[PDB]
Amino acid sequence: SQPDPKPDELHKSSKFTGLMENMKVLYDDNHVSAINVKSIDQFLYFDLIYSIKDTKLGNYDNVRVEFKNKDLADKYKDKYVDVFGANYYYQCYFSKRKTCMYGGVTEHNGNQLDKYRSITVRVFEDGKNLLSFDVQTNKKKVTAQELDYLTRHYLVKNKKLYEFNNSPYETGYIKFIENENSFWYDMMPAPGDKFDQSKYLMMYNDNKMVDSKDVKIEVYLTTK
Amino acid sequence: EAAVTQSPRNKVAVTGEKVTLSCKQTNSYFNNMYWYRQDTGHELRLIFMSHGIRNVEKGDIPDGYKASRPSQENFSLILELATPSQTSVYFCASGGGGTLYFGAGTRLSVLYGS
Ligand SMILES: [Cl-]
Ligand SMILES: [Cl-]
Ligand SMILES: [Cl-]
Ligand SMILES: [Zn+2]
Ligand SMILES: [Zn+2]
């Protein structure tokens, strides 16, 4: 289990002077999504390269999925898997049209549910749970990344979580509770002049999974 | 040969109107694109840049503008609530490890309301 964030631990959006669009866009309508596919190349020893066409916009024919370590790369190489990720293009390199992501991989066989499951998200604004809603998945074991993405996607459309210039919210974190054990991610960008998509998204490289049946999601936002 | 097509070439709008200028690469797949505006027969001033897809970078003169790079070929400039003061000629450019390719320019006139 992970300790809840100490006061000044959380990133303050007022201390970020770049364009929030560069965070917003990671959680827009688009994302990497593939069903039942096998790695077809590898660049470095901790990544795998999948052949996935961006049918929608033509932005990529292949996808580099990057992991925290060799073991995760080894584990899923040769496996038939489902991919779901928030992807980046700017400082994305690997040896056509390309994109890059971290983690976001689950075994295909035996992970498919017959019906979609609902997971409740409770959104606290300055400590008041004034909005709740459900995200949905059809995977038994789902990555935190996918759930995070689905959650922020909604919140962008419906609460302007991220805008072009900045955000109405000063701080924000997303908490994943699974029984007793729990963890969280900082939803705001590191402080400074520019936002580093690659670095931010790297947090997903642990490929952390949760159980769709018994996970709950809490999101804590504070205003300025 | 690599080129850049802005759209439209000439536009008139009312104060308060949402205006969108388009810029599309043809025969290229370049990472860098640029939106400038030119003041009155003088220097180009950079509003926004983009180092690639899903990247926008502030320029010298970004206030009151937004921009958007949803794919390599396309870099759009967004005026959310147009101001007369944004009356100008605007120039798009793409760029590629050596050269720059410029659009023909968009003359935008933003008039006052009733
Ligand atoms: Cl930035
Ligand atoms: Cl200057
Ligand atoms: Cl400068
Ligand atoms: Zn000057
Ligand atoms: Zn730059």
Alpha-carbon distance of A172 to A90, in angstroms, equals 25
Same domain, A150 and A89: no
Q: Return residues with CB closer than 5 A to ligand 2 (ion).
A: B 60
Q: Which residue has the tokens 């596919």?
A: A37
Same domain for A42 and A23, yes or no, is no
For the CA atoms of B58, B63, B64, B68, the dihedral, rounded to the nearest 10 degrees, stands at 0
Which of A84, A108, A132 is the last residue before a domain boundary? A108
Say whether A59 and B71 touch across the interface (CB within 8 A).
yes
Looking at beta carbons, which residues of chain B come within 8 Å of A89? 52-55
- Bond before B8 cis per omega within 30 degrees: yes
Structure tokens at A146: 């996918």
> Does residue A207 share a domain with residue A125?
yes
**The domain boundary residue, chosen from A87, A108, A129:** A108
CATH number, domain with residue A142: 3.10.20.120
Q: Is residue A124 part of a domain?
A: yes
Distance from CA of A218 to the nearest CA of B (A): 28
Domain boundary residue among A108, A138, A155? A108
Residues of A in contact with B68 (CB under 8 A): 21
Asked if A121 and A184 count as a contact pair (C-beta separation under 8 A), the reply is no
Q: What angle do CA A185, A191, A196 make, to 5 degrees?
A: 75
* Torsion A25-A27-A28-A30 (CA) sign: positive
Q: Is the residue at A223 inside a domain?
A: no
For chain B, give the number of residues. 114
Same domain, A52 and A157: no
Do A210 and A124 share a structural domain? yes
How many domains does chain A fold into?
A: 2
Tokens of A18: 């770049």
Please name the member of A25, A58, A165 whose beta carbon is closest to the beta carbon of B54.
A25
Q: How was this structure determined?
A: X-ray
Residue A143 and residue A129 share a domain: yes
C-alpha span between A142 and A201 (Å, rounded): 17
Cβ separation of B52 and A90 shorter than 8 Å? yes
Q: Do A136 and A175 fall within a single domain? A: yes
Same domain, A151 and A204: yes
Superfamily the domain B1-114 falls into: Immunoglobulins (2.60.40.10)
Domain containing A80 equals 31-108
State how far the alpha carbon of A153 is from the alpha carbons of A29, A58, A159, A212, B2, in Å: 7, 21, 10, 18, 36
* Contact status, residue A82 vs residue A113, Cβ threshold 8 Å: no
Report the DSSP beta bridge partners of residue B107: B10, B89
Residue A224 lies in a domain: no
Interface residues of chain A, partner chain B, Cβ below 8 Å: 18-19, 21-22, 25-26, 30, 57-59, 88-90, 97, 164-165, 194, 197
Cβ contact (<8 Å) for A97 and B29? yes
Examine the domain organization and report whether A26 and A58 are in the same domain. no
In sequence order, which ranges of chain A are alpha helices (DSSP H)? 21-24, 70-76, 144-159, 197-201
Residues A71 and A166 in one domain: no
Q: How far apart are the first and last CA of chain B?
A: 47
What contacts A76, CB < 8 A, 6 or more positions away? Answer: A39, A48, A105, A107
Regarding whether A94 and A44 lie in a shared domain, the answer is yes
Is A166 in the same domain as A200? yes
Look at A197 and B54 and tell me if their CB atoms are within 8 Å: yes
CA distance A179 to B20: 49
Q: Note whether residue A89 is domain-resident.
A: yes
